[PDB]
PDB file of C-alpha atoms in Angstrom:
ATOM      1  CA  UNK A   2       0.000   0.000   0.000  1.00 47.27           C
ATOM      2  CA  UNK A   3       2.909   1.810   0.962  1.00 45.20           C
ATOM      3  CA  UNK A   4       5.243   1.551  -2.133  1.00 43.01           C
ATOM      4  CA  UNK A   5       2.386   1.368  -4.935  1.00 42.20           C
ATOM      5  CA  UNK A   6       0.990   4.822  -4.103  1.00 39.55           C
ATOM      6  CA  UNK A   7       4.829   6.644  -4.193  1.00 39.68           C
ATOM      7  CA  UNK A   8       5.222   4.462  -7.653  1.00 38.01           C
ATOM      8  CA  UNK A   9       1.703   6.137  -8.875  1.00 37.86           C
ATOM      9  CA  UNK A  10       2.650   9.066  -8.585  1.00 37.68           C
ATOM     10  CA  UNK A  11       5.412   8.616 -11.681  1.00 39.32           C
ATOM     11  CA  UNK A  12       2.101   7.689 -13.430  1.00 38.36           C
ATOM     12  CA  UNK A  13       0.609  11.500 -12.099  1.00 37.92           C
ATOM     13  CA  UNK A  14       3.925  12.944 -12.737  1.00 37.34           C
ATOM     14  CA  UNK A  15       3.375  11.869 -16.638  1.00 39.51           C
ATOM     15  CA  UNK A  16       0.200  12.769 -16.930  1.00 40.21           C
ATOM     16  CA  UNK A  17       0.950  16.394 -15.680  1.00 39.76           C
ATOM     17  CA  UNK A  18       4.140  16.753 -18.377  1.00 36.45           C
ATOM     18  CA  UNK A  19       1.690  15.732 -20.901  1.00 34.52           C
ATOM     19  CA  UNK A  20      -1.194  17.939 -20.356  1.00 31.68           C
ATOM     20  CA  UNK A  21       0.893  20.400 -19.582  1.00 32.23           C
ATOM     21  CA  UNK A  22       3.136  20.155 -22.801  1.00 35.28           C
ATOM     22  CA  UNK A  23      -0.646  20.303 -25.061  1.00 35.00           C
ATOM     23  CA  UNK A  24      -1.323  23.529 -23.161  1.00 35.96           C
ATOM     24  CA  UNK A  25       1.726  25.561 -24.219  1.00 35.32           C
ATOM     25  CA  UNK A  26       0.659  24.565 -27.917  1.00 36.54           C
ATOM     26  CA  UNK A  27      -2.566  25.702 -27.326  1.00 39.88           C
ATOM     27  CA  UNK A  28      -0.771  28.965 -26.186  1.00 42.31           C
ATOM     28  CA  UNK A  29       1.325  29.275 -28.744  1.00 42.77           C
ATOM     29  CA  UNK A  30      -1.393  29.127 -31.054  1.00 42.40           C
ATOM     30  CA  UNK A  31      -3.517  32.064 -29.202  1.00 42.37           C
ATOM     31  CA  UNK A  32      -0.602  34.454 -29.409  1.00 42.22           C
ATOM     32  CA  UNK A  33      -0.273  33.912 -33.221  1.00 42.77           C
ATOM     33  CA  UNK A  34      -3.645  34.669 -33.003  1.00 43.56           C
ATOM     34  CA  UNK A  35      -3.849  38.200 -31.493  1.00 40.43           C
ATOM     35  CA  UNK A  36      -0.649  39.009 -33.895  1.00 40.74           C
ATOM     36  CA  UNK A  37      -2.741  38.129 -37.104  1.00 43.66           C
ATOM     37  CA  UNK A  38      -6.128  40.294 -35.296  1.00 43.30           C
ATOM     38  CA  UNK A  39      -3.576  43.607 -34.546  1.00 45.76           C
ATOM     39  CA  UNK A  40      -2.256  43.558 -38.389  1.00 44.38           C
ATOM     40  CA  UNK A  41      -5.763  43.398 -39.504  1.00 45.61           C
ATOM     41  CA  UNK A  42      -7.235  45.964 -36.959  1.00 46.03           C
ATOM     42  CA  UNK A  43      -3.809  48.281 -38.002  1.00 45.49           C
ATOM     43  CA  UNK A  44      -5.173  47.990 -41.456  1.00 43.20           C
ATOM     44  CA  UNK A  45      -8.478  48.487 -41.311  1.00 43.29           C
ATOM     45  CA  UNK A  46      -8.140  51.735 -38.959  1.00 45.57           C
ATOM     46  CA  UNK A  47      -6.495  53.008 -41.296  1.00 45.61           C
ATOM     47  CA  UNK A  48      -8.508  52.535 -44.419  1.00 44.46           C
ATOM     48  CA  UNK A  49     -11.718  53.519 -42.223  1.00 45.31           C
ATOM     49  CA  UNK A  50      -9.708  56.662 -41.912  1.00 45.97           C
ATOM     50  CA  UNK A  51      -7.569  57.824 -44.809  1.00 45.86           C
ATOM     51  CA  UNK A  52     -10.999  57.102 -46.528  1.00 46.70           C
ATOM     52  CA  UNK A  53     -12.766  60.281 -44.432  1.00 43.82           C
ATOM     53  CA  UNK A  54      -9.732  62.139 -45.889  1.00 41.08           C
ATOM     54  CA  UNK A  55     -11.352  61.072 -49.147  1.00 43.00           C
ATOM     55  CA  UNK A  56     -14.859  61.463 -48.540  1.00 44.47           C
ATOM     56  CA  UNK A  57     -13.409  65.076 -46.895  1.00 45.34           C
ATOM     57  CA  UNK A  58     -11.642  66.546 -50.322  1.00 48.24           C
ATOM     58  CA  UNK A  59     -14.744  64.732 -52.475  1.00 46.15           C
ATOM     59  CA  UNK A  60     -17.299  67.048 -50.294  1.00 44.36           C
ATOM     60  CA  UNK A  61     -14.773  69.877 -50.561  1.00 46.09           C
ATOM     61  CA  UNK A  62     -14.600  69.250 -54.033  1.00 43.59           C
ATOM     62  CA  UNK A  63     -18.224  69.672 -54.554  1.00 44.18           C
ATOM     63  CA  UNK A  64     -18.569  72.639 -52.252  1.00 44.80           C
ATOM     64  CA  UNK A  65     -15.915  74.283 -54.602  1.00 45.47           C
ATOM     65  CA  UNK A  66     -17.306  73.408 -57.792  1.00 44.10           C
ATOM     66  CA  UNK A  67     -21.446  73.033 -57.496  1.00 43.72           C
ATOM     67  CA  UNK A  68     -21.573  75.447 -54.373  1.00 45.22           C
ATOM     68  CA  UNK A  69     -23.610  73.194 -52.431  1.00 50.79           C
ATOM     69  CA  UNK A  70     -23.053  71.141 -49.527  1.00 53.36           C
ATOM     70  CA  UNK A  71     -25.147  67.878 -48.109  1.00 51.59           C
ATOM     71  CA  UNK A  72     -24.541  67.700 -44.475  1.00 50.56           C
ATOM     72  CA  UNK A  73     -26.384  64.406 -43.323  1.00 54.39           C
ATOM     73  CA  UNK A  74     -29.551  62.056 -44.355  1.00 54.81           C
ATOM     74  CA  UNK A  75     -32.126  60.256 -42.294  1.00 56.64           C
ATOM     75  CA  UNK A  76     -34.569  57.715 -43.120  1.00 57.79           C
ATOM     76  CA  UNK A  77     -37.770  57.901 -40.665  1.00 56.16           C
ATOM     77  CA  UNK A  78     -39.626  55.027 -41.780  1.00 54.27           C
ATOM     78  CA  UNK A  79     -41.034  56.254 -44.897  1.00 53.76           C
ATOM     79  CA  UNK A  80     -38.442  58.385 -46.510  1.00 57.13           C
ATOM     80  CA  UNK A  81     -34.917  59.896 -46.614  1.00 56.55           C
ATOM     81  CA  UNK A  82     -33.989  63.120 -46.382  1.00 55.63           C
ATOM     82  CA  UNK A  83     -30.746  65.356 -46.696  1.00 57.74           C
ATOM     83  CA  UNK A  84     -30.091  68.659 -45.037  1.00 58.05           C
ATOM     84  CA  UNK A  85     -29.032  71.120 -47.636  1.00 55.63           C
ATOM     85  CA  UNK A  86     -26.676  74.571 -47.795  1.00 59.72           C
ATOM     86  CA  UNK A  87     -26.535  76.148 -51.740  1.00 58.31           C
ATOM     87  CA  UNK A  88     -25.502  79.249 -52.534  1.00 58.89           C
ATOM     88  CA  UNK A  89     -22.073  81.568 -52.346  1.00 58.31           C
ATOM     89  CA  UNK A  90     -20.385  82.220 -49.733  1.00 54.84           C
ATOM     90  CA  UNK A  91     -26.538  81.010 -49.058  1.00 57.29           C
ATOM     91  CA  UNK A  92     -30.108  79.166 -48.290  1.00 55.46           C
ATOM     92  CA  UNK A  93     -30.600  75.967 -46.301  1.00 56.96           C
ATOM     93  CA  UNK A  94     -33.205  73.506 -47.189  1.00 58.73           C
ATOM     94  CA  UNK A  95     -34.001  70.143 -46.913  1.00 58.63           C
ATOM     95  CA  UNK A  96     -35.047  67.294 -49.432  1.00 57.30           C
ATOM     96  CA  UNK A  97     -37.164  64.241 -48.751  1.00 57.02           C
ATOM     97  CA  UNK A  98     -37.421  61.069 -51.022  1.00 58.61           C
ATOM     98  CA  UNK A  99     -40.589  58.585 -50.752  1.00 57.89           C
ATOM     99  CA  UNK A 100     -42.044  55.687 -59.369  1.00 56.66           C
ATOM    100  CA  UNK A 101     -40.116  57.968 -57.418  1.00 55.14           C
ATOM    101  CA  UNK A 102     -41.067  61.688 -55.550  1.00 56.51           C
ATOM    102  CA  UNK A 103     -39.395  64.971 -53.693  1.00 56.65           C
ATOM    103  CA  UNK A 104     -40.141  66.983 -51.691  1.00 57.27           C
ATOM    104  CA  UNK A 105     -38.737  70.634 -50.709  1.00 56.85           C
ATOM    105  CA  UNK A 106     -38.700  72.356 -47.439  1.00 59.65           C
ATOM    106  CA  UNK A 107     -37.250  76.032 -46.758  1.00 56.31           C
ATOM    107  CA  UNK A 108     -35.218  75.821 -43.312  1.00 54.60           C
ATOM    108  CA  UNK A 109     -35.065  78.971 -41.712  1.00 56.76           C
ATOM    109  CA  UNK A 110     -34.720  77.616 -37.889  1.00 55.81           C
ATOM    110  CA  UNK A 111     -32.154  80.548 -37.453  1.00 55.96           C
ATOM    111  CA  UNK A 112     -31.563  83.408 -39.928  1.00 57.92           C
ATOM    112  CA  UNK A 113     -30.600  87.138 -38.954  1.00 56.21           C
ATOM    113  CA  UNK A 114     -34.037  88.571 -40.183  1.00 57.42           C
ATOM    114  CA  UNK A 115     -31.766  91.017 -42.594  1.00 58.34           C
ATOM    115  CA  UNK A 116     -30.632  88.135 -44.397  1.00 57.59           C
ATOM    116  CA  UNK A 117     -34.236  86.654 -44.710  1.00 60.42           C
ATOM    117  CA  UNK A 118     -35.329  90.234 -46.380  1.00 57.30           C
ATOM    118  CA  UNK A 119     -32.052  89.771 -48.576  1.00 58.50           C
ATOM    119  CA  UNK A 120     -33.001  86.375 -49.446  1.00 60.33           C
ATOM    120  CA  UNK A 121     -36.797  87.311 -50.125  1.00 62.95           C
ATOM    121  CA  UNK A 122     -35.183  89.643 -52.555  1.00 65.83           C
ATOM    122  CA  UNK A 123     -33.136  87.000 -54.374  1.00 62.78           C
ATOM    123  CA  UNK A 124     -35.640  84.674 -54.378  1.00 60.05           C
ATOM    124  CA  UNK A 125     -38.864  83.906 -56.062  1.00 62.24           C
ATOM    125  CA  UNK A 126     -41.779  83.246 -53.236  1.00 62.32           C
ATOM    126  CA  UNK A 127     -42.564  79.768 -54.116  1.00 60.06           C
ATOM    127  CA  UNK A 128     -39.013  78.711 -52.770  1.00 59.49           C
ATOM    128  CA  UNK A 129     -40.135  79.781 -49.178  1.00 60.63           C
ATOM    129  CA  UNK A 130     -43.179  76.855 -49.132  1.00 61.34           C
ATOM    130  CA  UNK A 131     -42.936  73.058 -48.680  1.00 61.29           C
ATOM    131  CA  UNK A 132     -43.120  72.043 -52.468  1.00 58.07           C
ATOM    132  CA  UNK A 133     -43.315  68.588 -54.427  1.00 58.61           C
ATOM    133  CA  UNK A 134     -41.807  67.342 -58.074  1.00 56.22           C
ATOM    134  CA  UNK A 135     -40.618  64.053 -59.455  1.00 56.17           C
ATOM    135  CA  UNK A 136     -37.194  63.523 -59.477  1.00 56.57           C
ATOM    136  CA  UNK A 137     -36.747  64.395 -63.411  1.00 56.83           C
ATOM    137  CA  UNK A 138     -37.540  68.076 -62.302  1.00 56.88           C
ATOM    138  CA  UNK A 139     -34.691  68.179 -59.326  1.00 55.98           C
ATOM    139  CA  UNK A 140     -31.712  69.379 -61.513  1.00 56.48           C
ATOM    140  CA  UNK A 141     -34.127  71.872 -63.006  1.00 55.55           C
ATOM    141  CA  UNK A 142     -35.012  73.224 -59.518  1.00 55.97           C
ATOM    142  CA  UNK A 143     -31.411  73.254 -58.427  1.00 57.46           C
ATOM    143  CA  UNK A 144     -30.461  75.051 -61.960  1.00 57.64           C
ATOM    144  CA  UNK A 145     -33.208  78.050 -60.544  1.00 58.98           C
ATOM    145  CA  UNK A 146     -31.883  78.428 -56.873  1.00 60.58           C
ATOM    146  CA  UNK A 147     -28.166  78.998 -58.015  1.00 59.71           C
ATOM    147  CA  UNK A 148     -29.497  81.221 -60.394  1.00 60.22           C
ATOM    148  CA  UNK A 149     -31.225  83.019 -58.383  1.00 57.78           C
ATOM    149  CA  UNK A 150     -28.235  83.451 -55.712  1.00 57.26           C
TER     150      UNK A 150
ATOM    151  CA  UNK B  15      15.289  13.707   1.473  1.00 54.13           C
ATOM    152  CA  UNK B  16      12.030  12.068   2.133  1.00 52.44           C
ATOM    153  CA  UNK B  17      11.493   8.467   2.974  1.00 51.82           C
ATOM    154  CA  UNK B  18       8.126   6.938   3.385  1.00 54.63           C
ATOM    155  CA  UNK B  19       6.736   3.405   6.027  1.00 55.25           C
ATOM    156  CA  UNK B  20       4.972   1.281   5.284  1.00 57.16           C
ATOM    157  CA  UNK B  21       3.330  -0.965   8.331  1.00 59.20           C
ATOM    158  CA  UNK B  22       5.199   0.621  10.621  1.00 60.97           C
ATOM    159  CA  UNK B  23      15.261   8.363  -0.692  1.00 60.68           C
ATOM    160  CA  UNK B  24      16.673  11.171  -2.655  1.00 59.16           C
ATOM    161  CA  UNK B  25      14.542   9.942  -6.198  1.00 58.27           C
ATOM    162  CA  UNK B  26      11.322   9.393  -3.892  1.00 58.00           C
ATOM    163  CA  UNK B  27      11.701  13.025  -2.219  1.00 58.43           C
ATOM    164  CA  UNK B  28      12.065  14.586  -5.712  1.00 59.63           C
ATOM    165  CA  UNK B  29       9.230  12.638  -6.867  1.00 59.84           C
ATOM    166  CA  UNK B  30       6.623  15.042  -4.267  1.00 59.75           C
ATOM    167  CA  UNK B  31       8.933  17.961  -5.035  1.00 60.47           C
ATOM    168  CA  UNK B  32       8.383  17.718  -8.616  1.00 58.31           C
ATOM    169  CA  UNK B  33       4.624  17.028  -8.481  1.00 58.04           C
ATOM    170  CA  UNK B  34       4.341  19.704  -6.626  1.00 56.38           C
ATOM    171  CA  UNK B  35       6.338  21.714  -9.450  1.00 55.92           C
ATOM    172  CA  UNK B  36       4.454  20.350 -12.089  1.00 55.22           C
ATOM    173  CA  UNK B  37       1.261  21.151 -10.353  1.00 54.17           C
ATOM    174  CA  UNK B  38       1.674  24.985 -10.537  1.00 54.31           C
ATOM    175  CA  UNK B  39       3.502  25.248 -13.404  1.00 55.19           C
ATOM    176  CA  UNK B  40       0.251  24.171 -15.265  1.00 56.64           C
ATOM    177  CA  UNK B  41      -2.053  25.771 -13.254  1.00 57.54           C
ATOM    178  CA  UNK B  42       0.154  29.128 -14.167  1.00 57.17           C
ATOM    179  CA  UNK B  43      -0.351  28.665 -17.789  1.00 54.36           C
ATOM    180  CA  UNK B  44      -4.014  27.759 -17.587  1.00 55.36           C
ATOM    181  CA  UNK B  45      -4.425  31.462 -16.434  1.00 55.40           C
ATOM    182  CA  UNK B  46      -2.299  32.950 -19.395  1.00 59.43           C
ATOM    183  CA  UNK B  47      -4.638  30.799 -21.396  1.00 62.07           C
ATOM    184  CA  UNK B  48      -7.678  32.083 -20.224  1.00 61.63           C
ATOM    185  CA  UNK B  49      -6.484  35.833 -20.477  1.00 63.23           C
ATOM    186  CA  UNK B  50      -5.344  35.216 -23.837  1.00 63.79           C
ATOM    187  CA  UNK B  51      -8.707  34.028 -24.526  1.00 66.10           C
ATOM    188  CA  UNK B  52     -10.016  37.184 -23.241  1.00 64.60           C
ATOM    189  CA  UNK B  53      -7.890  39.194 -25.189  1.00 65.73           C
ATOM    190  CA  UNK B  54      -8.678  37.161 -28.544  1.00 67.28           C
ATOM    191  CA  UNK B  55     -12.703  37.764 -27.826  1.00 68.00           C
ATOM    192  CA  UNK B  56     -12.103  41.376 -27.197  1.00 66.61           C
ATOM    193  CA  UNK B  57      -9.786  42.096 -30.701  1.00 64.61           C
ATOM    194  CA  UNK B  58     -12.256  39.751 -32.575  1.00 63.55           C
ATOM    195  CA  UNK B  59     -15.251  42.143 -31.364  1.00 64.96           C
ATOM    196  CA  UNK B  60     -13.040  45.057 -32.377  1.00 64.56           C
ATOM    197  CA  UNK B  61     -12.994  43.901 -35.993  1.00 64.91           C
ATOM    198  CA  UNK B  62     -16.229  43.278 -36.459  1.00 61.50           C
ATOM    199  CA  UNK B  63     -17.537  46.792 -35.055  1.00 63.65           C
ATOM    200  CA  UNK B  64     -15.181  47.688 -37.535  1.00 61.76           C
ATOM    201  CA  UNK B  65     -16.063  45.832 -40.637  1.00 63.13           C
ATOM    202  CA  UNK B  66     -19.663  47.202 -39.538  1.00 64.63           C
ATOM    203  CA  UNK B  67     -18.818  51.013 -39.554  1.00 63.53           C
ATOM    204  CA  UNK B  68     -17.067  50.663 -42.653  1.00 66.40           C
ATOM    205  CA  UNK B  69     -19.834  48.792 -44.415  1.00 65.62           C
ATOM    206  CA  UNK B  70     -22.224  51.081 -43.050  1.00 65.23           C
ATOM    207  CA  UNK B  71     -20.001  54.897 -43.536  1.00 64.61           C
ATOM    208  CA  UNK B  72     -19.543  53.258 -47.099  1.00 65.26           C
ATOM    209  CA  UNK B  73     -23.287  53.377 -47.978  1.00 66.75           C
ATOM    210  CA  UNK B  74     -23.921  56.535 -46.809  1.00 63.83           C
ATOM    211  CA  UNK B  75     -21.503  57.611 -49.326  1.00 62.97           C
ATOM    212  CA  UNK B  76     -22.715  55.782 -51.797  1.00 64.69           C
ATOM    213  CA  UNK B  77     -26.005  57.299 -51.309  1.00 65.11           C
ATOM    214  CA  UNK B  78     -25.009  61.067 -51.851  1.00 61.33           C
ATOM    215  CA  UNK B  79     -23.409  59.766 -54.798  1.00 62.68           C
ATOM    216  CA  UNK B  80     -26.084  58.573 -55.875  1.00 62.50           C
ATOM    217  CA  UNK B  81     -27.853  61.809 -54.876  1.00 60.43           C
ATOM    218  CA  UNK B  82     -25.538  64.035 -56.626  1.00 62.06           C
ATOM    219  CA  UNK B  83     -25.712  62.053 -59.600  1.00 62.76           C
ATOM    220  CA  UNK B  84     -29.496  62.963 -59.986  1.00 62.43           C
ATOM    221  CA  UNK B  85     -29.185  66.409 -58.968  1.00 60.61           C
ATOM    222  CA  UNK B  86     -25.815  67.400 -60.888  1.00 63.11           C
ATOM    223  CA  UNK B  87     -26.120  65.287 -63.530  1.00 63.12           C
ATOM    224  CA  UNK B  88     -22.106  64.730 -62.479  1.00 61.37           C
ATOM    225  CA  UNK B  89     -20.235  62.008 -60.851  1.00 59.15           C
ATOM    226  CA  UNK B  90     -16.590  61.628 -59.355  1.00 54.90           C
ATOM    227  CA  UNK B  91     -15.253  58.154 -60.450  1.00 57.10           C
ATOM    228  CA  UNK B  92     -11.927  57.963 -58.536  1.00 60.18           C
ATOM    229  CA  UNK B  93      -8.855  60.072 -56.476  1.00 57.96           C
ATOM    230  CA  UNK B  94      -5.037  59.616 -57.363  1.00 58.14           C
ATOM    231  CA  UNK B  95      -2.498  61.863 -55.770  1.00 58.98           C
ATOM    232  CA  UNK B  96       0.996  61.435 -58.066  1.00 56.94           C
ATOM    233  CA  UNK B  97       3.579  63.285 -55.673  1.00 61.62           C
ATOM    234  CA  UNK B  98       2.312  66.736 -56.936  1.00 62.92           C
ATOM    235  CA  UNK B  99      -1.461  67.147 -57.625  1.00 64.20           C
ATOM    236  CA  UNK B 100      -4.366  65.135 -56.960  1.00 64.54           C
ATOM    237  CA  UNK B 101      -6.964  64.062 -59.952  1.00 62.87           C
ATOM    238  CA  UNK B 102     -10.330  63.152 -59.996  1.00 61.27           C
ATOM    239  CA  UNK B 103     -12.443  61.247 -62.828  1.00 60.41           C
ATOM    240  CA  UNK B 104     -15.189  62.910 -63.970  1.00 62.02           C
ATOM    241  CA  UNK B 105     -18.753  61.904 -66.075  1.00 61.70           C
ATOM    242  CA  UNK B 106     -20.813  64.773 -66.527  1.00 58.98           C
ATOM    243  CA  UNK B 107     -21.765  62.407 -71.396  1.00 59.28           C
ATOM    244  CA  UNK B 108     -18.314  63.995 -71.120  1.00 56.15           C
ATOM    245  CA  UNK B 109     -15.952  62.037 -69.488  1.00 54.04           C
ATOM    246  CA  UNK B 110     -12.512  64.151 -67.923  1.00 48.89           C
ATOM    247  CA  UNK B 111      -9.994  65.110 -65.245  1.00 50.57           C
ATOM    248  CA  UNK B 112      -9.528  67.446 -63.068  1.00 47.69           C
ATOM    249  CA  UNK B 113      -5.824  68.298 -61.641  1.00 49.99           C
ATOM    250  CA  UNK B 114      -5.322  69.797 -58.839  1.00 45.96           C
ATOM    251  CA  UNK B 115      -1.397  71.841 -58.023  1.00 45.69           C
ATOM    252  CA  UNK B 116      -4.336  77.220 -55.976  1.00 45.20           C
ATOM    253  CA  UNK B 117      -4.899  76.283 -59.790  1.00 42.78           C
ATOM    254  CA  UNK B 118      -7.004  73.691 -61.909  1.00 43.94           C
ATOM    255  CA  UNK B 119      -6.260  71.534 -64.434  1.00 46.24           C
ATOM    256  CA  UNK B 120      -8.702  70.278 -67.147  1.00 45.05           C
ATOM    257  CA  UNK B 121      -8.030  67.741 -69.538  1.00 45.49           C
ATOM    258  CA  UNK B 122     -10.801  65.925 -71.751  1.00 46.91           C
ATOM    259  CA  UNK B 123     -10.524  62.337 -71.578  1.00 47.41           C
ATOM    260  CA  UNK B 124     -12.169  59.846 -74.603  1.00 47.23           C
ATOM    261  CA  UNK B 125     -10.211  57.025 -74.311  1.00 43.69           C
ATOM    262  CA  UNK B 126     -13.291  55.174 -75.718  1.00 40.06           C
ATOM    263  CA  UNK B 127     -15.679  56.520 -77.535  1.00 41.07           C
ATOM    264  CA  UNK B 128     -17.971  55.552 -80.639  1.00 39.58           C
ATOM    265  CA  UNK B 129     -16.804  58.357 -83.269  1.00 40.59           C
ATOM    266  CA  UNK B 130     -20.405  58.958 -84.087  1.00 41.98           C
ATOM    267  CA  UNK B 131     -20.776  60.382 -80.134  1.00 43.36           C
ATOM    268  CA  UNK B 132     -17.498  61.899 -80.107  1.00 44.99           C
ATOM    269  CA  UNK B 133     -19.015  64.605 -83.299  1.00 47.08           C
ATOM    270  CA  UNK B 134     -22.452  64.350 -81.397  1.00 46.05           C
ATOM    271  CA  UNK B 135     -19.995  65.944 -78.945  1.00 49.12           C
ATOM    272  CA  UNK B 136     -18.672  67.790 -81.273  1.00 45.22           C
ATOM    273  CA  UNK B 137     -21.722  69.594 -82.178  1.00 43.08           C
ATOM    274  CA  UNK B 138     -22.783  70.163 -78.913  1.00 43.69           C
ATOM    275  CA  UNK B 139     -19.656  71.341 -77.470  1.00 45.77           C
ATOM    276  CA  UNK B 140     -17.535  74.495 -77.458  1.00 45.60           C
ATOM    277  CA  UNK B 141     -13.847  73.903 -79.346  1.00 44.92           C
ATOM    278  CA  UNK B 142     -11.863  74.639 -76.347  1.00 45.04           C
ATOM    279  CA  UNK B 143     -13.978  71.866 -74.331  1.00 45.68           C
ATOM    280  CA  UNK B 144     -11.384  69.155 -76.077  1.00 45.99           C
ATOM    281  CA  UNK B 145      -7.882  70.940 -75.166  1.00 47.29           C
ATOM    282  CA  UNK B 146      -6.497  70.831 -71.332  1.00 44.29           C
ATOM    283  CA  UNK B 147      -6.786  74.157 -70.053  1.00 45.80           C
ATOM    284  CA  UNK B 148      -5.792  75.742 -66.600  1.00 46.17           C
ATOM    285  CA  UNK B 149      -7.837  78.476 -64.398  1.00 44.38           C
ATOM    286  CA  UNK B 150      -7.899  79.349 -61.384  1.00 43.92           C
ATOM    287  CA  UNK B 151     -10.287  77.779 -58.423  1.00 44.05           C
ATOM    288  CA  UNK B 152     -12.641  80.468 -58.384  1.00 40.33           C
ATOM    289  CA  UNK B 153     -13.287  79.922 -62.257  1.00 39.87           C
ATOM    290  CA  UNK B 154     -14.369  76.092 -61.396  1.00 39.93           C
ATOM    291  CA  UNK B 155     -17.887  76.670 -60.803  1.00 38.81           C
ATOM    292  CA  UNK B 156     -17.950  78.746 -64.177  1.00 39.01           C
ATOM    293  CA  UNK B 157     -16.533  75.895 -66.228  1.00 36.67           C
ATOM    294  CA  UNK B 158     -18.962  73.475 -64.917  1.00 36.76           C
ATOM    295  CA  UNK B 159     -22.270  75.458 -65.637  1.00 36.64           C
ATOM    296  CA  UNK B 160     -20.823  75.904 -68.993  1.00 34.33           C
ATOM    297  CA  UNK B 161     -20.694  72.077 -69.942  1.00 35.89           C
ATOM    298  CA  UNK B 162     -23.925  71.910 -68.134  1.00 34.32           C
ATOM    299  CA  UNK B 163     -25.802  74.012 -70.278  1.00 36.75           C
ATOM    300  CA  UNK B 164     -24.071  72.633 -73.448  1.00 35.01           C
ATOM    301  CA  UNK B 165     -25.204  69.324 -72.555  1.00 31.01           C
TER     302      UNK B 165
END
């Protein structure tokens, strides 16, 4: 009883060097791992980013050449719509999409009132009232406000 | 040196020594396993949140394209930047570049074109439109109406 416990435990002694050897492959296999998820994560950071840069000079490119600027877009269940700033350096709108429709929408939320007399000026009345055309008109509208300013 | 009874040494007193040994030495690296684990989970989340803001940024610009396509009749195909001067592809149909070095840089491009468009074109379009040219920023919004209101 004596002697064939202390001669088990070679048989424990074993069994630890071999469960322990299959553990530090299983650890050499996590780090390789996390090295191959950093590259990755390196490279995509930086192609989610540079690409703003992008995105930045296209929207800057527009502003420079077409004078108008979209600054964001919803969609509230039935529609999209995209905040709007045309003119030179100017009247915001917005522009709603629900066959195919539009819809216009003067927004004035804050305007000096001696800019909204300058604008009335400018522009012809209709383009102070909600208003709706199909989408083959929109470039024609657009054509009439930078006209206009 | 340990030395055991029965009823009632050296190798046999390294034999307890070294289970003991062995005993923490794995329990050790089952903790760096399960923290590596953690790690693993939390990278893997990071590039998914990231594949999703990309996928989603991505169609939101794909969707003002596709806005200023209808409302400019004009879209920007592509962005190079060769050491000096960026360019950008242009379909307004007249395809063309634009430099950039401020100044501006035009330059008509018709790679490929069916001749019987390209005098369609012709008709339609001012001489100068088919030479590179060079103005100055302020001018840019000028040149496009003109092409505009040719085509």
């Amino acid at each position: 009883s004596a002697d064939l416990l202390v001669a088990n435990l070679v048989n424990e002694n074993f069994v630890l060097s071999e469960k322990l050897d299959t553990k530090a492959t299983e650890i050499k296999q996590l780090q390789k791992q996390i090295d191959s998820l950093n590259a990755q994560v390196k490279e995509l950071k930086t192609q989610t980013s540079q690409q703003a840069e992008n995105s930045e000079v296209i929207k800057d490119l527009y502003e420079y050449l077409c004078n108008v600027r979209v600054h964001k877009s919803y969609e509230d269940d039935s529609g999209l719509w995209f905040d709007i700033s045309q003119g030179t350096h100017i009247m915001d709108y917005k522009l709603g999409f629900v066959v195919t429709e539009v819809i216009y929408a003067p927004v004035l939320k804050q305007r000096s009132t001696e800019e909204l007399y300058s604008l009335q000026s400018k522009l012809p009345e209709y383009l102070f009232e909600t208003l709706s055309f199909p989408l083959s008109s929109l470039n024609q509208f657009y054509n009439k406000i930078a006209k206009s300013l």
